[PDB]
Design a protein around this ligand. Structure first.
Ligand SMILES: Nc1ncnc2c1ncn2[C@@H]1O[C@H](COP(=O)(O)OP(=O)(O)OP(O)(O)=S)[C@@H](O)[C@H]1O
Ligand SMILES: [Mg+2]
Ligand SMILES: [Zn+2]
Lengths: 1090, 134, 122, 112, 107
């Protein structure tokens, strides 16, 4: 094909290859049923040709058509050959080619492809996505065959809606009998209806899968009477021989099952990781059975049983993030194992230990099933516990688990009655003196108090005095954890009461009542009531602060509550009790827990209230201790506070000077502790500031790198071993050693320019090792807003990683370290391998919109038209925007196609891109992020993930601008086109739903963090006319309150006075972001058409 | 082998993979498979540490690489003298890891690093064909 | 009520709460059944009656399957009623066939036979 | 008619709430501190026109709904609230004069 | 209050919730009646125990909307939870003790 002339070879080869692929897709015929080796050879030929640059240069999409091929047939053949990723890639290529060909002259494409080629695109995509195994992708495949019972049943099974699946399986008769009965049996088993399943199987007695389900039910129900060997048949035979003490047959059956499972697994093509999980689960179950075989063989001892249970618990901890469909069979086998061991014990001393092990295992199984929103299995486990662990004492942990299970089923009355009965029995039995029952008593009291607070069935006074304070008073790692939980619960309840009392005091009803008396005993009664209310508020405040301090001491799980504690301390600065308890016991808190709030704590410090219990003295002591323990995390912040006005000094209010004096005092203390490090850090900061102030307009056109002038002090600095690279993230160390950290060695002579109005400078900093880091030095710009926004992003990343659903999908927010140096000077980490999306898409020279679709409108024409239509009415804007969108098609889908040629890598990168878009959009909406234009978003070339920069505009301050921003986030046509053929459907929508659910579940933490951030005196976040003019070429208290209320409404889901579910809110946000009506009214600089 | 200090679980798996770089026959790997199974069953806290360390880059995870290497080894053992012995050992070692969430969807088969560098060395299409054929 | 009920059980052997529950069940007023509360609510039969009152047939079916100390006739009747009220006609028929391997049992069998139009059985 | 009237009323109430919202006041105050003024005037006029159109559609469909049947006679409260609040609007008064006088009289009794 | 009373309260609250728009429109018509003096004045306050109007009307309307939707203390509540909050606030001995003697809370 390289030397072909007149396209004779091209035409001949295309015709013959298309004929071959069509012949492969028949079904005998004259030529059909070809061997898979020939199909794989031809697929390899096509794949090799796809990766070769054509003689006419062009693009990768052009390079795909070396031969005229109908890629739908090739994709179907590849799917038949179990090459699912390349099948999806070829289906996407075929869809793109069909769209391009149609433009010259999914459901519509599917029906057209069915009309000519006889293959439905939607059905092929559904089959490929089912074969891949990704759960989210199955939702956006299509809607053509949603009505069919098989698709509905598959959807029900995927979502674990077992009742709906059972009803549909019973109702539909057109389904084949084998599949129908298998689904009925599986749904009955998953619903806990073991007896019903057994009787149903007995009724069916009037295919290998039926016998397989028979054996699975037999071994799960321990019938021991229902008698190539399959898997569950082997397991049942092994259990029967284990009961019969026939160890030879037991080991032989286990070995045969191992061999068969491994052979069946290796016979497959092994394309996706999701195809390996069931085999791994079955092998783990077989291994555990073989492990207990030797324990049964010899004499049973308590130590051996404890060790095997410890091994089981560890290996279950290994499976924390596994799907329930893989964990459940292992737990079932463990339960049957323990039941058999208890049955065949014949020794009272060991029988009690076996009973304890079984009770612990069943409690763990109940907890695991509850974590997956399953209710039948916990009830069955509790029933089994009752059957074995017959109870007459009436106090046990499994009863607390039963109460939790009943609560999970929305039967609050039964759970509350059980828990109150347990509480009364514990109180009657002893005065919390038994060491074993102390934890159970404390947990029962705390849980009952929390449940009563949730259901509003008791007044706050009774709940506080009877349950939560008592739980704290009742209360060695388990005891420490219980103490932490009780302290947190008491602090939360006290904070709730204090917040209720403050909301009442700040409400309009209270002010109206006060003003009514403004117009004689009534005044005295009002004064008495006000004094009583203030006293109650102070008492609740003190209790909440004390319990928060105690909670931070005894654990680390609830560390993010330091935000609420610091907010309570800062707001009530004048209260001596709060300051006193912060000075006495607050200082005992580990210093590393205050690091996320270092910016606010440093900005709040001053020299006004000096005294023994003065707020400023205690705050200065806390800051000094934090800096002493973690100099690398705090020295830059304090020094930047001290160097706010050093820019003018280097070149040539009472609060501000007090803050500067406090920063200087802390700097003097640290220098007294570590002089050399402070001196070196000061020299580095001075060099950075001097470098930033250097004029760069001389080399504005230069792009090959500029040598730093020799007069710059930065070049002189060398071997600073006491200074860590400021732009490098540092892992927090509880110990204050920090011995092994990369240190600054030298700076490369050359520096580059990144473009922009102010012309920032890019420099390279080689560390102690050979690696070097690129740093962006910015002058005449404020980076503190970026720093605090990055802190918010880190907190949101912690929240996302903590939750299981967002951890499985690896939903994260890309962050870069920012180190502000002065009021208008700073330095931040330069992202490597990231190119702006606007640079990739609408570049004038080699943009994607020019290389692909050269006949469409140029970006210059679109910008000119949208700027011209600015002065006209909304109808003219809409018409011009629609006309531009008609002549400006998305091109962004080729980024991953041209950067990643391997279908598997391409699929992974595209999925990562979609997840990054979803997470960034949701998080930015929650924070009210604006100014999300093309130049403010970067995409990493290696990972295909988006990084959001220029975080100046947030909290919906862009909607106050002229030509307000009317979109929650950027979801333009290019962004959706990068997601694939499905668009926003499928992965994107489900990831947005997961992120929004996580945001909803953590509304209090986010509210506390944002409240701490907004009330920071140095955080400038309110829009001003000067900034408004620059962006497009006290009232503060009420504005902050309105912003906090709007954020609370967003987190709760209240949109325009209507409470919405997570899915509905996501649907509203998506439809508002993709609406062309809102996009047309946006600023032309935002580039909505891109 | 155990000079310069003992081996941890990660080092044991790395040594197993390095031995697996060149494999004449699957049956010669039986003792290594048994030793790997014993090491895996002895230490699982180190397996938790490995999983935590591999969280940042799940694609380069050690555990998924070991699983796919074992699966390929079992594939190469089909229709040979020691088919069942190798299959049993592979199943024994895969039973230890179990269905751990690897945070990956695409299986990445091992590829020679020297081959890619040698291909990158040649800048002409005809020369690359000569290198591959030779 | 609980203290009075236990005192009455101690003295005369009659529980006030249980008598009130029986009286309210005999009266037939639906909202009155929720007034009676105590430790008797955790019994499986009380929970099953509460489930059947609220037409939560899935919970009733699960509890009927799980509990074995309940008398067999009541268990089978509740299972059949819950199966029928969930639309599981085929499952109910196969379950009845399996039970082959009480007047109420044949009453339920005839009800299922005429509902399912199974005219072969006589 | 009832469904169309409800949707039109929802849109009109959304535009009224936005006009009375604090965000609108903040934007107006920020603009006070010259093409931006012209753009704001154009946007305000367009918003007022949309509000009036939605109000007229809602009133017309409410009146049509009251004529057709008696199952939704309770919406006379909403219709009269819209009429009373927008008393200066000539289109609403004309619609009440032409088709509002064909409504049965007993339906106005509750708020007499 | 644990029998018929609680369930009847739940049913009535559910009916109120399902007709929030209707009740809101009715109360909007009523509150803006020029001759309906619903607001409190010092004369009535003194007699009972021996513009700003637009703002207070809007606040009353939004409070009624919050009640009808179920939002109490900024937290959305189900019908059962709201009835539970109302009953426990009504039968609270502290609130009854703080009340005016003429109300006769002990009766
Ligand atoms: N962390 C970063 N990594 C990579 N590039 C960055 C980073 N931060 C900024 N840039 C680039 O630096 C250039 C200017 O950055 P900005 O901070 O946006 O300057 P500016 O004041 O916003 O002026 P603009 O961008 O022309 S409106 C742009 O090309 C950005 O893409
Ligand atoms: Mg920018
Ligand atoms: Zn054939």
């Amino acid at each position: 094909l390289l030397q072909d002339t007149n396209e004779s070879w091209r035409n001949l080869l295309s015709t013959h290859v298309q004929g071959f692929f069509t012949s492969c897709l028949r079904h005998h015929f004259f030529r059909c049923c070809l061997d898979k080796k020939s199909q794989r050879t031809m697929l390899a030929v096509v794949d090799y040709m796809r990766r070769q640059k054509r003689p006419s240069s062009g693009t990768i999409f052009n390079d795909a058509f070396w031969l005229d091929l109908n890629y739908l047939e090739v994709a179907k053949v590849a799917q038949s050959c179990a090459a699912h990723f390349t099948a999806l890639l070829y289906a996407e290529i075929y869809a793109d080619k069909k769209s391009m060909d149609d433009q010259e002259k999914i459901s519509s494409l599917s029906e057209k492809s069915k009309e000519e080629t006889g293959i439905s695109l939607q059905d092929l995509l559904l089959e490929i996505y089912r074969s891949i195994g990704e759960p989210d992708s199955l939702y956006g495949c299509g809607g053509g065959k949603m009505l069919q019972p098989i698709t509905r049943l598959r959807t029900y099974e995927h979502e674990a809606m077992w009742g709906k699946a059972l009803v549909t399986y019973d109702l539909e008769t057109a389904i084949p009998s084998s599949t129908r009965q298998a689904g009925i049996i599986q749904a009955l088993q998953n619903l806990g209806l073991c007896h019903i399943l057994s009787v149903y199987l007995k009724g069916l007695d009037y295919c290998p899968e039926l016998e397989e389900l028979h054996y699975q039910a037999a071994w799960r129900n321990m019938q021991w009477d229902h008698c190539g060997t399959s898997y569950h048949e082997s397991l049942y035979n092994a259990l029967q021989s284990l009961r019969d003490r026939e160890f030879s047959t037991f080991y032989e059956s286990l070995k045969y099952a191992r061999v068969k499972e491994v052979e069946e697994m290796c016979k497959r093509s092994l394309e996706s990781v999701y195809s390996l999980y069931p085999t791994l689960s079955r092998l783990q179950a077989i291994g555990e059975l073989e492990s207990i075989g030797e324990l049964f063989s010899r004499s049973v001892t308590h130590r051996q049983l404890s060790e095997v249970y410890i091994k089981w618990q560890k290996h279950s901890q290994l499976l924390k993030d596994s799907d329930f469909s893989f964990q459940e069979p292992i737990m079932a086998l463990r339960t049957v194992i323990l039941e058999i061991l208890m049955e065949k014990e014949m020794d009272n001393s060991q029988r009690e230990c076996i009973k304890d092990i079984l009770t612990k295992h069943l409690v763990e199984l109940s907890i695991l099933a509850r974590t997956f929103k399953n209710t039948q299995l916990p009830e069955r486990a509790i029933f089994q516990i009752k059957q074995y662990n017959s109870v007459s004492c009436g106090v046990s942990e499994w009863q607390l688990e039963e109460a939790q299970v009943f609560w999970a089923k929305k039967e609050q009355s039964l759970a509350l009655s059980i828990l109150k009965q347990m509480i009364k029995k514990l109180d009657a039995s002893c005065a919390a003196n038994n060491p074993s029952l102390k934890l159970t008593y404390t947990e029962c009291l705390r849980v009952c108090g929390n449940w009563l607070a949730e259901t509003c069935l008791e007044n706050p006074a009774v709940i506080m005095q009877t349950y939560l304070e008592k739980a704290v008073e009742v209360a060695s790692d388990e005891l420490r954890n219980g103490k932490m939980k009780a302290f947190l619960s008491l602090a939360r309840f006290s904070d709730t009461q204090y917040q209720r009392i403050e909301n009442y005091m700040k409400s309009s009803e209270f002010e109206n009542k006060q003003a009514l008396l403004k117009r004689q005993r009534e005044l005295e009664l009002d004064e008495l009531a006000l004094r009583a209310l203030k006293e109650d508020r102070k008492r609740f405040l003190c209790k909440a602060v004390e319990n928060y301090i105690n909670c931070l001491l005894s654990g680390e799980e609830h560390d993010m509550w330091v935000f609420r504690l610091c907010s309570l301390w800062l707001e009530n600065s004048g209260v001596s009790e709060v300051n006193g308890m912060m000075k006495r016991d607050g200082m005992k808190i580990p210093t590393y827990k205050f690091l996320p709030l270092m910016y606010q704590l440093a900005a709040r410090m001053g020299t006004k209230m000096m005294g023994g219990l003065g707020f400023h003295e205690v705050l200065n002591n806390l800051i000094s201790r934090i800096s002493m323990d973690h100099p690398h995390h705090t020295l830059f912040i304090i020094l930047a506070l001290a160097n706010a006005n050093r820019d003018e000094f280097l070149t040539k209010s009472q609060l501000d000077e007090d803050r500067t004096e406090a920063a200087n005092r802390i700097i003097c203390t640290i220098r007294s502790r570590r002089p050399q490090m402070v001196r070196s850090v000061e020299a580095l900061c001075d060099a950075y500031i001097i470098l930033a102030n250097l004029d760069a307009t001389q080399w504005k056109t230069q792009r090959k790198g500029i040598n730093i002038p020799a007069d710059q002090p930065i070049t002189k600095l060398k071997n600073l071993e006491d200074v860590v690279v400021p732009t490098m993230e540092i892992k927090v160390d509880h110990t204050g050693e920090y011995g092994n950290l990369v240190t600054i060695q030298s700076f490369k002579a050359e520096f580059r320019l990144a473009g922009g109005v102010n012309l920032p400078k890019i420099i390279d900093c080689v560390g102690s090792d050979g690696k070097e880091r690129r740093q962006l030095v910015k002058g005449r710009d404020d980076l503190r807003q970026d720093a605090v926004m990055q802190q918010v992003f880190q907190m949101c990343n912690t929240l996302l990683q903590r939750n299981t659903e967002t951890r499985k999908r690896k939903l994260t927010i890309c962050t870069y370290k920012v180190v502000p140096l002065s009021q208008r000077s700073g330095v931040l980490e330069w992202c490597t391998g990231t190119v702006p999306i606007g640079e990739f898409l609408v570049n004038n020279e080699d943009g994607a919109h020019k290389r692909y679709r050269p006949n469409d409108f140029s970006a210059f024409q679109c910008q000119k038209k949208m700027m011209e239509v600015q002065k006209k009415s909304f109808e003219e804007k809409y018409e011009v925007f629609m006309d531009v969108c008609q002549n400006f098609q998305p091109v962004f889908r080729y980024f991953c196609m041209e950067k990643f040629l391997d279908p598997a890598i391409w699929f992974e990168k595209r999925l990562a891109y979609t997840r990054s878009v979803a997470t960034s959009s949701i998080v930015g909406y929650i924070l009210g992020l604006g100014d999300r234009h093309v130049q403010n978003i970067l995409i990493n070339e290696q990972s295909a993930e988006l990084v959001h920069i220029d975080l100046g505009v947030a909290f919906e301050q862009g909607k106050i601008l002229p030509t307000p921003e009317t979109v929650p986030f950027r979801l333009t046509r290019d962004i959706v086109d990068g997601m694939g053929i499905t668009g926003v459907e499928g992965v994107f929508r489900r990831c947005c739903e997961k992120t929004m659910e996580v945001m909803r579940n953590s509304q209090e933490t986010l509210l506390t963090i944002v409240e701490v951030l907004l009330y920071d005196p140095l955080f400038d976040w309110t829009m001003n006319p000067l900034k408004a003019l620059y962006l497009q070429q006290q009232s503060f208290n009420k504005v902050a309150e309105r912003v906090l209320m709007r954020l609370q409404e967003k987190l709760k889901g209240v949109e325009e006075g209507t409470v919405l579910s997570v899915g509905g809110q996501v649907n509203l946000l998506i439809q508002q972001a993709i609406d062309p009506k809102n996009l047309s009214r946006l600023f032309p600089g935002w580039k909505a058409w891109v | 082998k155990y000079s310069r200090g003992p081996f941890s679980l990660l080092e044991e798996i790395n040594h197993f993979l390095s031995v697996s770089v060149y494999d004449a026959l699957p049956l010669t790997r039986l003792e290594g498979l048994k030793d790997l199974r014993r090491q895996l069953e002895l230490h699982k806290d180190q397996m938790v540490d490995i999983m935590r360390a591999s969280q940042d880059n799940p694609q380069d995870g050690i555990m998924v690489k070991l699983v796919v290497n074992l699966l390929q080894l079992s594939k190469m053992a089909i229709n040979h003298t020691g088919e069942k012995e190798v299959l049993e050992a592979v199943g024994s070692c895969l039973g230890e890891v179990g269905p751990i969430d690897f945070s990956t969807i695409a299986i990445q088969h091992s590829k020679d690093a020297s081959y890619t560098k040698a291909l990158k060395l040649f800048e002409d299409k005809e020369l690359q064909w000569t290198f591959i054929m030779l």
